[PDB]
Symmetry: C2
Subunit: 113 residues, 2 copies
């Protein structure tokens, strides 16, 4: 199993992000959000939140923690395509902690499942 196959086979949603936009993701991510990978490539994380306000609020919660610690994890309500709300465990590591919401690796796991 090479790194590409690992990324795509992974049992959790994985994202390579830059500036809160999904640059690459796996099928597990697509599945959690009830869409296709193609729906998510080049898409702002905003669309996965219950609202734009939530996307803003949680971004402001992420930044200081990521800067201070170099990693981030939380649980939050997120929104599937079609509107269904669900609890989701999310973890993140920024490429540079002082640029917390820039390039990074992000994980998503459905907690209702």
């Amino acid at each position: 199993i090479d790194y590409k196959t690992a990324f795509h086979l992974a049992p959790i949603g994985l994202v390579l992000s830059r500036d809160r936009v999904i640059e690459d993701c796996n099928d597990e991510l697509a599945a959690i959000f009830r869409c296709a990978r193609a729906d998510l490539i080049g898409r702002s994380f905003e669309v996965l939140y219950p609202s734009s306000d939530e996307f803003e609020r949680i971004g402001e919660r992420i930044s200081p923690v990521m800067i201070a610690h170099g990693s981030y994890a939380d649980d939050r309500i997120m929104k599937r395509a079609g509107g269904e709300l669900f609890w989701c465990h999310v973890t993140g590591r920024a490429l540079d902690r002082t640029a917390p919401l820039a390039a990074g690796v992000w994980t998503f796991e459905d907690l209702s499942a």
Copy 2:
């Protein structure tokens, strides 16, 4: 970020496994188990369980669930280098569900830290 860097910088422990042996892993995995990556490469998952019996018991629990569903997730107690026992959330996907404990991708996350609710 290429796929190699994603693997190595991931915020959770990642493992590329074959027959319950760790073929590759990231630094987060090493950190969780309080050792070096070099300590884990070519290492049986067995050493990370509280005991051989646990390794065997959990293997038997993984198998039918992985075979039936093509994925696996649980929480269990694992063992750090030095013997400290801790709770760990683990997920796995086998390359072939009918060979559930052969080649696969596995994740590990330490549940010791208080969960942040955003």
